[PDB]
Amino acid sequence: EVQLQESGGGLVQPGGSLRLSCAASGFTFSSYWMYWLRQAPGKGLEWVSSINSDSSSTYYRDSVKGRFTISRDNAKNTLYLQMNSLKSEDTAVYYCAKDPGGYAKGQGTQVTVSSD
């Protein structure tokens, strides 16, 4: 079975930084396009970023361009999301997925951006 597990979520102030990691097993991670998705309470699952196997192509939702950076280690079967300049609107459970529908994704990691 496909195994995906996100980590690196946390509570941060607006303008803060987190580095999400996603460990993959049960499939040939090094062959696949990989995706970051996210879902806030009461809202739909949405696409955040894509990266191809060889890291030659990356894509980002308009709202995170210049703030979020996707990368991967095909030897460590790990997908990364460096999140800088974090905004209140970025609050959500973040998912790594091997498909753009979130059919095969992890249990997620909570990212909370708030002044409190």
């Binding site: 396009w33 949405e46 696409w47 894509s50 498909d99 753009p100 529908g101 979130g102």
Partner: protein, 117 residues
């Protein structure tokens, strides 16, 4: 919210026929092909990976090579349409369409193949 819909999610098909199975996704005015990601899979098999405006064939399953096509002219209508030609008994099963177009969602379709003559 962004929802993929399947107004028909059951296809009972004759052996050796062609079929098109369809998932709808909302499109406002002109489709942005560069924002669109459409996958078709069934069980543990890769059928279609259409990624930011271009199909990637690298991981496509051998059983579906040359028989499986995403109808590109349907995408602008918010229709993810998978054509399978020369349907096999082994084509029977649950298909999934997985789509990112801002939002992310998927639906499942049941395909049943009637015995040949």
């Amino acid at each position: 919210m962004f929802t993929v819909t399947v107004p028909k999610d059951l296809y009972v098909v004759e052996y050796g026929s062609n079929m098109t199975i369809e998932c709808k996704f909302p499109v406002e005015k002109q489709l942005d092909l560069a924002a669109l990601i459409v996958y078709w899979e069934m069980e543990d098999k890769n059928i279609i990976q259409f990624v930011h405006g271009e199909e990637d064939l690298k991981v496509q399953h051998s059983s579906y090579r040359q028989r499986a096509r995403l109808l590109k002219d349907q995408l602008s209508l918010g229709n993810a349409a998978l054509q399978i030609t020369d349907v096999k008994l082994q084509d029977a099963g649950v298909y999934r369409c997985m789509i990112s177009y801002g939002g992310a969602d998927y639906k499942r379709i049941t395909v049943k193949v009637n015995a040949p003559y």
